[PDB]
Amino acid sequence: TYRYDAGTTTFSSDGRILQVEYAIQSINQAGTAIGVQFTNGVVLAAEKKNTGRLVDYLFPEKMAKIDGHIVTAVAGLTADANTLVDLMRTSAQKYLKTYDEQMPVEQLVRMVCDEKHSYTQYGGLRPYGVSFLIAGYDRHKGCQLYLTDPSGNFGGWKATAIGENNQTAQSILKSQYKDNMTATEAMDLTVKVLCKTLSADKLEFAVLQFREEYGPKVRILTTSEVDTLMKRY
Amino acid sequence: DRNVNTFSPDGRLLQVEYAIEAVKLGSSAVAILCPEGVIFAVEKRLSSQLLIASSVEKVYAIDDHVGVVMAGLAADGRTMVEHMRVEAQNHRFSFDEPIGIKAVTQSVCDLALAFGEGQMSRPFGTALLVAGIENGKCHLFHTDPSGTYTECRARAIGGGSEGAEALLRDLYKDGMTLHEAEDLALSTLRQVIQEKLNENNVEVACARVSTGKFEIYTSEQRQEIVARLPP
Amino acid sequence: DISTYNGSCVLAMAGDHCVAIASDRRLGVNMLTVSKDFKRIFQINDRIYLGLAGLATDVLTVREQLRFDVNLLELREERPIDPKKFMNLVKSTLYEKRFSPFFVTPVIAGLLPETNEPYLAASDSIGAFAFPKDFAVAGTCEESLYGICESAWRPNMNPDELFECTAKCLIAAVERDSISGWGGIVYIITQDKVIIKEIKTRMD
Amino acid sequence: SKYDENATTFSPEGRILQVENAMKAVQQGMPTVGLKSKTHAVIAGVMHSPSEFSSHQPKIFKIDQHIGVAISGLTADGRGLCKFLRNECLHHTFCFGTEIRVADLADTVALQSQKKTSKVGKRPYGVGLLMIGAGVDGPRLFETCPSGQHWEYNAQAIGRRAQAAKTYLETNLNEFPDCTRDQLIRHALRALNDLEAIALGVVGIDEPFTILEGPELQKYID
Amino acid sequence: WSPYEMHGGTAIGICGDDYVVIGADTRLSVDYSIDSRHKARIFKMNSNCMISATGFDGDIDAFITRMRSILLNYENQHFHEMSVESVARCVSNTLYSKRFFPYYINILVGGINSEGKGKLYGYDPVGTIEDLHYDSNGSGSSLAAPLLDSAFGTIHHNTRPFPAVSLQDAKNIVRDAICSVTERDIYTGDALQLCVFTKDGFAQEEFPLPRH
Amino acid sequence: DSDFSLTTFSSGGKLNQIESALKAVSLGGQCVGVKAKNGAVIACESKPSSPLVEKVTNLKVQKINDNVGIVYSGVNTDFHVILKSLRKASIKYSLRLGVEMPTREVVKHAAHKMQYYTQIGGVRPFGVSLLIIGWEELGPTLWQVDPSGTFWAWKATALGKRSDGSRTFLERRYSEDQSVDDAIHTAISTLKEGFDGQLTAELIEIGVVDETRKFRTLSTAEIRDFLTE
Amino acid sequence: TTLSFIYNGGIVVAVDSRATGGQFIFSQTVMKILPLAPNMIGTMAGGAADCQYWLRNLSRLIQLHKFRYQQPLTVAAASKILVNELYRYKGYNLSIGSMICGYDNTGPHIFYIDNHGSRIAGKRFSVGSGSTHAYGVLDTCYREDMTKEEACELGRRAIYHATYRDSGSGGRVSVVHITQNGVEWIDKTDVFDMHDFSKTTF
Amino acid sequence: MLSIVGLQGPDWVLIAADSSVSSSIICMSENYDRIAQLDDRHALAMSGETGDCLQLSEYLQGNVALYKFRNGVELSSDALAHFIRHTMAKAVRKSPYEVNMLLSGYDGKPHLYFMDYLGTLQSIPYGAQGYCQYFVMSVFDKHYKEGLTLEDGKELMKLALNQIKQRFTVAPHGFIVKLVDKNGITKIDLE
Amino acid sequence: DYTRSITRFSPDGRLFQIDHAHAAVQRGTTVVATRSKDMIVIAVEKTAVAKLQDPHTFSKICSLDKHVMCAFAGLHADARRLIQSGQRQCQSHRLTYEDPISIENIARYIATLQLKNTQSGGARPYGVSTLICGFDDMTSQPHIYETLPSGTYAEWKARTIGRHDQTVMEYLEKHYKDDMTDEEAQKLAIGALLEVVENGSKNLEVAYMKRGGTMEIMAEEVLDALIESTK
């Protein structure tokens, strides 16, 4: 009967999928996740959703390694973000299995975004209320950072920010982001943006770095590493 | 709110009636059947001069002998045309004969009510005029979104359908010639449109008994009909 | 036969806190030598190596399905897969195809994460895993390796001695197997480094 | 009104308002009359005329060699029901080699429409049938309704103007049983006031079901 | 296990300018045993054509039932009975629809087209269609085919016009060919269903055949 | 049709069915968790509907596998569904990999199932929040999984009735260097604050993952000893 | 025996007409050239039912494409459609040996297609049991600059020699001459008439 | 089991294939291209049933094009080789592609991959599928120098193909040889 | 599976979901496709990109095939799905038919995807208008079809989609010529977009497919030269 159906995959008078717009709002009310693309790699830095003196910072709530060459930061619902992270990991491994090559970052982004968009356009199910900052490396586009939203729309960003106070982080990145940054410089910029738009415990970091011989490596900074990075700032 | 399959308290399928309205919003098309064949004349609504008129097609050759002209949603009419072409070629394959005009019209109409909810989501927003040659006899049918095909001798579908019917009521006769059928179709189209009728804004076609073929008129033939028109 | 279609010879061996896993380098199409650069031993992780003896087709299919599985497991669990856990993963992968088995026999040579103890896991094509403390053998040279290693293996072989028997005990087996050989490669996984020694076998 | 949204929703007075809306669709169809005799059955229908230059759309259909249906309501629904009826006839002939009975076809149509009303998303057939068939069970006339029920009639009138035809049939009801095929056709024509718009399908215990229109019907128009 | 019985029996079609004569033995026999002596293997399909079938009787009945249902569907959805050409194409398509589980039956579609002309179509089990003027099917097809070739010489000279015989000359050719096949084919006999499709329609005669 | 999500974003970017399921959790019986240095504890108020209830027949503190145990606050029946799913997932994990499902993997599976029911159509979210205790390489770990499928680790927690006051009480009374004994005492104390009337051993269930890495549900006798110690 | 060759004057497609099951000639008048499009035919070799059904289905698909799209369907396109349809039944024991011959925008084209999925473009093909004999005639007597009569006679004679030397080939040579101006059905010539009974060597 | 040969050089790959297609004992065509150019960089010589090699070639070329269009980047020679191997392994498990291939490629570096019907992927300096691998290997082995000039490579490929012609009983009427290098794939004539 | 009738006729005969998809297209960025006898030029306005946004490999322009360019206006993910289907279809047409898919055929396919979404229960319409352009063959005239969320498609001498479609279309009509050269078509598209872009060099991108060629992005230097020549 669809009496209580919300018509999730239905346009609104303005031509917007209301469920996708509300998912975007949910993201904008979530912890800030900033991505900064430096010379060889990308620094992702997210605000943990679940913090407090009684919370145990054992795992990255928002940072999720997708593959040896791709890491992600989450803004919004960490649950459906985890679902899409599982799908992204499976897609990267399927690409590796098919081609014996690490999935190009844009293809993994396209896959997760096609999942999101399939939820926005078919099935009458709510969209994934998560925005991903997918940092990655591939031989084609070098090191990349992609911002993906619940609509399934993604774009490459040298630097960007999502979540709470994402506009302030974006403005700070515009003011201070420079090309050809070093890993240290980009980490400092991300820490500065996070602090200016918001504590090491609450914050989590992940540096993708491409070395010529070692390849692309994802390193999600632990509590102690993030504490050291914050104290450096 | 209510399902697309809802019957109104009057007993009308609300979505079918709304699809008929969508047809009423479509380009005017007039089919005139004469003992010498049947003629489609459809308005091509050239919104811009950069619009390729040849690509804006209401007339579709379903088969060598039968064709259709659309009024309403061009894409839904395209789906109906695809079904009709598949069914005309399937009939040619299954029975080694051209599909009957009634047969292909009924085939496309059986798809009209196939919409549902809880298949298509909605009725077709296009009405068809299916004119063809079956066993050397010219047949013409009109189908509405309800899936109700009725054989016609002179029908009009689209923007000026009511006005075209009023004009044909005292302009169409059962013993006209092919030239007279062309003149009547083109005149009815001109009088039930909001633009001038030239070889570019009109698409003409004929299911001709003489050739037993549904041929869509070239620019020269449309120019000839336009020139011969008295006004 | 399809099991002998690609002649294979994989030989893991236990030393003193070190494993060896050696393989013949031949890719042969039955009696034809296609290549001498075929990789049958794959690093699963820093302390797990998988020598896949059998159909080069299934060698790559199972290596890449196991890489898929291990990469997913290490992404989800954020820790390297343990040699025992990878053995169970290989067993699951091979028995998932119980009714259409891979024509590959695995030989898992690893070091246990804590004690660095050698871990050998040899199985049949469908994941029936043995856990020899001395040596695991696989491939068309299976019986040859069994005999040579049963006589040759000694406890507490250091990486040098472990490599020496892996190489000798593999050379003897491949040089009796017509379809396997054409060079050998021995990965000696010790507690701190992996030594990949390409050994000269007969090329006939 | 609020209960008139689905064929699956009963009203507080135990009614399916969408079924009644499909019924009203049938009632707004062209007049259709059916008559039954001991040996012949007839369905005469004033075929709809959407325009003066449109041949009257057929409503008297040929289903089985001894079964014919007059569809009143949504023509496309009637055509889908006729495809279903052809499937049932084909399967009965396949299974048993004999022509299915019009009573069995009426039962299948009733079941199909009842299914269309017992599940959401699917809609009652806007068409109502007058199926006449002369088989082993004799001549039988059935009015199949959108709700998913059929009524066996000696005579019946459905669609618009049906009241006058129904009264005429009631007047001559007791005559019909023994009335000859020609007499039955004449009764159907009298009961069904519009000539060319009137088709008339007649079936008999011996004769197959055949449709007469205009000239073929002139001998009985009287 | 073969799902057929390869029953046998011979059918012989001869088309003429205004007729088609298909004579088929009615014997239903297999493995030196006669299941039936009068099993008509020629079927009036509609007012335009008839289908003679030889081969497995279960497949004959299945195919004839399917073709009768197809022709009934055509007559309902087209309001005119399927033409002999349309029935012939339907027979080809139906036989090919079981291309990989064939009706092990040889079909002769003999009818009258809209022009009043006798149209005969021969088929193989998988639905090859030959628009021919005479054909033979069944256990005695090899016996009868040279007989029709002699009667018409079409095989001898295939580009010469078909020397169409009188309806009674075609009936006599079919009768004589069936009698010869019966004398030499053990699976042909017990009766000849000699069906003739003309403008007048379907006319069936039964002629005794040797029952040995 | 069924497969339309009844959990959908509202105008404010909030899944209102998620908040409703969290409310169902907040009326679902106080459950506490406390991470010790050498283990973790999941206690919970298990006040039966009647004394005639047989406690062992429906226990909120449950074992998912040898190393992972689970308690819940919320709807008992869909907690049992989640628990069957988690035990099945850990058995599948053992079949595939020869070891019990890791604590974090059990938590991620519970979170995935809850998120699934938050997104698929025709279903409501699970009206339970799970406190899953189990060991990992780095030490004991208490985890909370919400009806939304969002999971996160805790040092101490309360989920059910009066869980805000219980969480404040844990903030005040929880310490990092607690032993399993002290974690059990802290969990019992938190239950006492979140429970009115005499808090006895039969009215609470305690599960513990201790130095042995194995999850065990303390019997009523052990709970009595802890209450009297 | 079917054959089709491109020469400077167009495509000559000559087919026999013998349908032979086992050693018995079931027909000598079977049509082994099927017109697919106004400028394109398909030849039949192999299973008669398979060849005729699948060339008929290719004709249906070509007509569907023609009505659906203004873009003309090339001979390459028709051959590819047929070979994909036949590969759809790979392992179903279909037996089609066909030549999709005809003129498209790019000129003359012959594609030998078979149930095995092969699709070989060429200027000269012969399929069927007598294909080797027709090849013996074609490869020897073929000239690019033949006349229409000479090319039709070349195809006719290749089929005739195949019929003489092949038991499975016989009947009448149906010769079609495809040009840019369409498929011309030259004639059906009884190979019995083509045999030179003055000659005694064969 | 048609003869396809491959010869990887320092910056090129000469990929030859039996150019003659036969219907049983009849050579239907003599210029049949069995080296399907999946890409401007990759030529896949195929050896097997003409109708399974054609279908596999069409699928692989369509998927390479789909990868190039869907993802702006092109597949690497290694990536394309592993995709082909994935296709062949899936098939052999389900419905084997009875096509043994030599994937020559140049994605900035020459690549030659032995690719049996099963899904045996092996980078090779030279190779062959069919029975010609029994005839050409030794030739290559005896005459392949590291760093061959393209003309020395053409002479070596001519040597191998003449070995096939002279010593292989089912000797191809001829070979279609393609050079896969930085300039793409070009049909070169070995003379 | 979800099969709600998302797209249904309104009482006035309009499919309001198609209207909302058109609104989504309008909120999409502007594309202009122009044709010269031997060239097709698609100029798309780059969305306002900060200094932090990578401007490469995110153009709205795409190649459905070596002969088919595509550009879109509307929801980027809807258009991504449409482009994926279109590329799969171009390869599928090559598989089924050796010939490359005609621009009419591929535009029909994409518009039929949009039509199916307007007809499929539980499927939202594609909020995307697609300018699908290319050459059927070497000798075929360049084609520029515009497919709308409704699933209707029409060929155009020059067309625009997205925001400012009115203004860009007016510019095209004022400045279109029957036999424009490659340079003239490039200038037409570039100026038509220049009228409604804050910056010429930055906000504007161009991709041209010449006859017998593939999609080709304009060089920034050559694009700037053309922009300055227009101004």
Ligand SMILES: *C(=O)[C@H]1N[C@](C)(CO)[C@](C)([C@H](Cc2ccccc2)NC(=O)[C@H](Cc2c[nH]c3ccccc23)NC(=O)[C@H](Cc2c[nH]c3ccccc23)NC(=O)CCCCC)O[C@@H]1C
């Ligand atoms: C060149 O030299 C010619 N050779 C012959 C053999 C032609 O006669 C072929 C190859 C030819 C192709 C063909 C195409 C179109 C029409 C007719 C013929 N092949 C045949 O004639 C085949 C031979 C045959 C027998 N069994 C097989 C199996 C696989 C492939 C080929 C064959 N004959 C047939 O297909 C029969 C034709 C036919 C027509 N009327 C019949 C009545 C009774 C029996 C057979 C009849 N059909 C069958 O054999 C069907 C068997 C079904 C069993 C369930 O053409 C080239 C040009």
